[PDB]
From a paper:
We were nevertheless able to refine the structure of nucleosome 4 as part of a tetranucleosome in the 4×177 array and also in isolation within the 4×187 array. The H1 histone is present on nucleosome 2 in all four structures, and is also observed on nucleosome 4 in all cases where this nucleosome is structurally resolved. We found low Δβ values at nucleosome 2 and Δβ values of less than 6° at nucleosome 4, where H1 was always observed.
The structures show a zig-zag arrangement of nucleosomes, with nucleosomes 1 and 3 forming a stack. H1 contacts DNA with L1, the amino-terminal part of α2 together with L3, and α3 to stabilize the nucleosome and contribute to chromatin compaction.
Numbering used by the authors:
A (entry chain m), I (entry chain q): 10 to 118
B (entry chain s): 35 to 109
C (entry chain n), H (entry chain r): 30 to 124
D (entry chain o), G (entry chain k): 37 to 133
E (entry chain p), F (entry chain l): 20 to 102
Write the structure that this text describes.
DNA sequence: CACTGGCCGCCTGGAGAATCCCGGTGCCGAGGCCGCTCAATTGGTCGTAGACAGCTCTAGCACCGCTTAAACGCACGTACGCGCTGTCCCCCGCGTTTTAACCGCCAAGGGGATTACTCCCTAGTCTCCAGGCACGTGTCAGATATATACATCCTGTCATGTAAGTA
DNA sequence: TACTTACATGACAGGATGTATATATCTGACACGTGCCTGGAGACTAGGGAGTAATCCCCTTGGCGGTTAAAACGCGGGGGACAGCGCGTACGTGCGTTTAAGCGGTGCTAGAGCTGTCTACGACCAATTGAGCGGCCTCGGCACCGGGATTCTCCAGGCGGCCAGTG
């Protein structure tokens, strides 16, 4: 007489896996106990981050008139947002290249 | 129009006549104070000073080329 | 047949579809996205563990995650993530 | 008369070319050889995934482009446009090596 | 079998291309050898850690997994090979 | 109780002394106010971290151990304060 | 005529003294007042352990001495002995701020 | 009546007297040694934790910390450390 | 009846507390299991590290005609050992100061 | 003395080439469907981590009175950034020749890596005890002060080399 | 044309002052004794992670032929590095002054912290399923090829300014 199996991601109205992130926290050994709201909150944080970065990547690709996200688009999306740049200054995206940035002394008169 | 550049360079160097030769920067300031477009005539004054040092009316004190110090001839 | 290797494929794809109904993603950029989410998850988990240690608390709470996100994410990213997590935890507590 | 661009113009044009482009800039297989050469200095008979050579490569252009951008900043700081040994040493000194 | 000198395989045009990606306009002649030395030093700093990881795993094969893990430890974290 | 212009409390000779410890011989006069700005940025970051630690503990008295934690999170490790 | 040293010699003696000495270079009370002002922006009615202000003081002097030694490196890189603001922005921008 | 606050005074003092019979200590430097051993403990323990986790190993062994000390300490610090650690675990095995 | 008490540090011939290191490893959430020789090895490396740093501190104190270690001695010990300085590069010692270090162009003549 | 050609700098249009942009085409990764299985879920339980109230005590804060150390400021000086120019050479661009990188194609085998087994090792629990320690005390290494000795820095002075007037 | 004299320069002695150096002194911070209790150790068990044996197959290594893009080399040359030299300023240094930090003392209390209660809350665990991953197939987005237009670049050519030679 069990109830229907509903999902905690749908309970939070989210698509990031609440159960799987909770599993990764429990087996990732950060404490012996993990509160119930913590993986939900974390999944919301991750989903917001991924949503806005894919948003920036989508506008970059649409600006690049490509309908598919390529790592160059991700690199442009990271480095054109200063807060994500400060978040991710220490990382390298594979095959991302760099921003087109020219020092003014390099350009001719 | 007025006079050409050689006379004003001679006036610039003969206005002061320090023990050491006059520097090019002070000479530019002197000719600007007298009133002259030094901006589009840097090449003009440099070739003029080479012309006048080469023709012996004025002698180079210390420097080489347009740099350094310029003082008058012995007589 | 080979054993299952976990990925963040379907979740990030569904989020991309919600934020952009039309566009697609390459597979290698998709692996980059997987690495991104894994790295950020690791960072927040590490901060949560350290604050749990510092306050001698045995339990990772939503408060601890909120404090860790405010620690790590800068500015409007921090308060927007706080707002999103707050809305999510209010929805989950309301079942 | 045969045609010839002035110096730097080709340089700036392929600045724009390589900053627009994303692909690898080191030749693949000599880099793979160099990686194995370093590997046998620590342990003999090492074997490498192809992706391992790829990842060492991506990290290598990552560190080299970052170092070279910082030395470019050091060089334009010294009122020059050509990077020098002192630029490399300076960038590694502030960066922490 | 053995390898005795392959550092010249990172050719002078390759250093030129790397400088071009970084935005460098003009490169001195003495640059190339010490950039080979710098890329050298960075490589044994990474690969020493990588083979330490590998021998800890009792494997004789370097993975890109261990390479990006060595980059993770060393502080030049890489996206695009994890997992 | 209200504090209005406290950045000038880090006086000019104090910055001169700090530059002397750093090995600086000659300092421009334009230096001091932007070092006040940079120092303000450093403290506002680290105190933002430490204050966040403090309100996390449901305390409103700042302890030194949290300041050690904040410098740890900035990677600026400090010994000598019970770390 | 009263005695007077040439410039830098007093500065070099300051270098040797303050690199020899270990005590604080900024005054205690205005720094504590400044820390209270900065923390007033985030939370009202904070109190501070004295050791917390001391640790923040150590962080401040350590960060600034590091900043000025890298600034000195930048200045001598530009063939100068006088540091100027572009040295500090260069050092911070290479270091990652 | 007090609550318990732990530190590493006696061990640093004994090893100091072992390396120098006549050399003293100040209390501030003594706290610096306390925080030093704490920090090196967190570094080695955390990297041992990653070496354990990432290879699907649930246990810290002596081999785990041997790999970790090989990682963090540069050059002959690593070799001397692994040498005396090997000698110490050998004595503990023999006793 | 029962064996007489024997410390594990004395079993390893060490001064650093093997039992306390084991306890802190268990409560430090690094793994749920810790091998028996693992804290022995960790105490050994900690004892060794303290040995060279305190030895260099004592040598610097002897150079300063000082009987007791001051934090200045610790700063001098770390920054004059490039192996330790590589270990503790991002590290501040409180009240340690810096090395006497003057660039060559700063000197007169 | 005035005219006029000649040299230099500046402005401008045109030719060529890299690139942008427009098409077609064929291809292979992306996306979507299906099968599968294994990990999230439900529900309950149990033990316990932390919230909550309360009580203590200590240290952080507020105030104040002297007490000089330091900060402010100004003035004089000098040395340092720096702007300009001139020179030299060194690296960019381009053409030619070479060469090995790459592709792509095929063989081999060795090691990841998976499953199974069986076993040593480690967490757990109870008991016991001794080592680390808060706390107290005393006491000498070092701070502090005073008096010397020398290092060092800046300057005045004397011998020398060189430019200049002149017999 | 060579001789004698004035100015710039460099070497050296010497004084002022800062800094080492010897010694008295007191002091409080370091060093050591003591009650103790709490965390470390002994012993034994459950059980399980993990070492190890066997296999496989997949991925890595090895090697061979062809092409050509890339590397190497040489020439040329122009542009950047940089040395030097003057200038003007802008900090350093040293004097005096203000004041505000700093030290010492006092009082308050607010919050840190520590103790007891309990109760919500999260881990454990058997049964269950459906959500997410492995595998397969297709096609259309996109890489590649090809052709026209555009922009950029570099240089040839035209115009003005000044200057110097000559009738």
């Amino acid at each position: 007489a069990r109830a229907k199996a509903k999902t905690r991601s749908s309970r939070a109205g989210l698509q990031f896996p609440v159960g799987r992130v909770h599993r990764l926290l429990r087996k990732g050994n950060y404490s012996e106990r993990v509160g119930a709201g913590a993986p939900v909150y974390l999944a919301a944080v991750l989903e917001y981050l991924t949503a806005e970065i894919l948003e920036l990547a989508g506008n970059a690709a649409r600006d690049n008139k490509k309908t598919r996200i390529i790592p160059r688009h991700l690199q442009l999306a990271i480095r054109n947002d200063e807060e994500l740049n400060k978040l991710l200054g220490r990382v390298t995206i594979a095959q991302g290249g760099v921003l087109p940035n020219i020092q003014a002394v390099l350009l001719p008169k | 129009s007025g006079p050409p550049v050689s006379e004003l360079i001679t006036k610039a160097v003969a206005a002061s006549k320090e023990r050491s030769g006059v520097s090019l920067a002070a000479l530019k300031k002197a000719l600007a104070a007298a009133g002259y477009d030094v901006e589009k005539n840097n090449s003009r004054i440099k070739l003029g000073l080479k012309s006048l040092v080469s023709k012996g009316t004025l002698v180079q004190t210390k420097g080489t080329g347009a740099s350094g110090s310029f003082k008058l001839n012995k007589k | 047949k080979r054993s299952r290797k976990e990925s963040y494929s379907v979740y990030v794809y569904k989020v991309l579809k919600q934020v952009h109904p039309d566009t697609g993603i390459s597979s290698k950029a998709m692996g980059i996205m997987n690495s991104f989410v894994n790295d950020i998850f690791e960072r927040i988990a590490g901060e949560a563990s350290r604050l749990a240690h510092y306050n001698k608390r045995s339990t990772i709470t939503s408060r601890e995650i909120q404090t860790a996100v405010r620690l790590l994410l800068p500015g409007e990213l921090a308060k927007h993530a706080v707002s999103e997590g707050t809305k999510a935890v209010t929805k989950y507590t309301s079942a | 008369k045969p045609h010839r661009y002035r110096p730097g113009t080709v340089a700036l044009r392929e600045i724009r070319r390589y900053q627009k482009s994303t692909e690898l800039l080191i030749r693949k297989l000599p880099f793979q050889r160099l990686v194995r050469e370093i590997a046998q200095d620590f342990k003999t008979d090492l074997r490498f995934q192809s992706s391992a050579v790829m990842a060492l490569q991506e990290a290598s252009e990552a560190y080299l482009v970052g170092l070279f951008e910082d030395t470019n900043l050091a060089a334009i700081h010294a009122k020059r446009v050509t990077i020098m040994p002192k630029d490399i040493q300076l960038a590694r000194r502030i960066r922490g090596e | 079998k053995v390898l005795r000198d392959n550092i010249q395989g990172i050719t002078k045009p390759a250093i030129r291309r790397l400088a071009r990606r970084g935005g460098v306009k003009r490169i001195s002649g003495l640059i190339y050898e010490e950039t080979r030395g710098v890329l050298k030093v960075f490589l044994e700093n990474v690969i020493r850690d990588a083979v330490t990881y590998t021998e800890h795993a009792k494997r004789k094969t370097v993975t890109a997994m261990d390479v990006v893990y060595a980059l993770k430890r060393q502080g030049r974290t890489l996206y695009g090979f994890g997992g």
